[PDB]
């Protein structure tokens, strides 16, 4: 008796916004019904429906923003990774794997060899 | 005040290290090839000992370079000086025996 998520993935944004308007009107009616009602199960369903509608709308907006910012060598901070303090900072892998050219020539000239003793 | 309750435990952990390091170093020994070196200090001057590293000149007398010898697992000390003949010769024989027993993968 409730909405599905995947059904809302197919819809256009105006269909989702009109569905939202419908659910808010349904909520406004169910409040008038619920001020007479001791227990109405339908309002608990429709608030979850409003939540899922907002989920699908926000998700489509965010993925549209990601697609328009896809090519650039930048991003809005909220769209970036969250990870923590200082995993933002202080190194990338490339900035840690980076080595001078002299030690590069040294490792080319004398790498750490593989040997087996007592043979 | 401190009591070494972990004396049993840490040894286990240490052998775990001696396991785990060995896992990465699977053919090679855990330790490098150290020199046999006679001790100072007349109380100990009859005692011979494990030294830190050999020298440049000794590794050249072994017939290789120290930069290559570190890749072979031979500990090398530049700041030591070879001043005794028999120490030098015995450690050269040690280097030769170590060269005899290794097989190196390309």
């Amino acid at each position: 008796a409730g909405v599905k998520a995947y059904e809302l993935r197919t819809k256009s944004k105006e269909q989702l916004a009109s569905q939202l308007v419908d659910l808010k009107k349904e909520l406004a009616e169910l409040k008038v019904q619920k001020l007479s009602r001791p227990s109405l199960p339908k309002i608990k369903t429709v608030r979850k429906s409003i939540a899922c509608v907002l989920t699908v709308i926000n998700e489509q907006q965010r993925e549209a923003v990601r697609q328009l910012y896809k090519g650039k060598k930048y991003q809005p901070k909220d769209l970036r990774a969250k990870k923590t303090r200082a995993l933002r900072r202080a190194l990338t892998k490339f900035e840690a794997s980076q080595v001078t050219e002299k030690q590069r020539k040294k490792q080319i000239a004398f790498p750490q060899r593989k040997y087996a003793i007592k043979a | 005040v401190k009591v070494h309750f972990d004396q049993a435990g840490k040894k286990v952990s240490r052998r775990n290290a001696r396991a785990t390091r060995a896992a990465k170093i699977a053919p090679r020994p855990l330790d490098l090839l150290r020199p046999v070196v006679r001790a100072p200090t007349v109380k100990y001057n009859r005692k011979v000992r494990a030294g830190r590293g050999f020298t440049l000149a000794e590794v050249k007398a072994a017939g290789l370079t120290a930069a290559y010898a570190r890749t072979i697992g031979i500990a090398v000390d530049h700041r030591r000086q070879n001043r005794n003949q028999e120490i030098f010769d015995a450690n050269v024989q040690r280097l030769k025996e170590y060269q005899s027993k290794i097989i190196v993968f390309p």
């Binding site: 087996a116 007592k118 043979a119 | 053919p27 097989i103 993968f105 390309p106």
Partner: peptide, 19 residues
């Protein structure tokens, strides 16, 4: 000795080198 012999063959194995 056996696996020593196997690794001795492997280190004794010439790699396919290029001039």
């Amino acid at each position: 000795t056996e696996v020593v012999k196997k690794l001795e063959e492997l280190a004794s194995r010439p790699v396919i080198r290029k001039e």
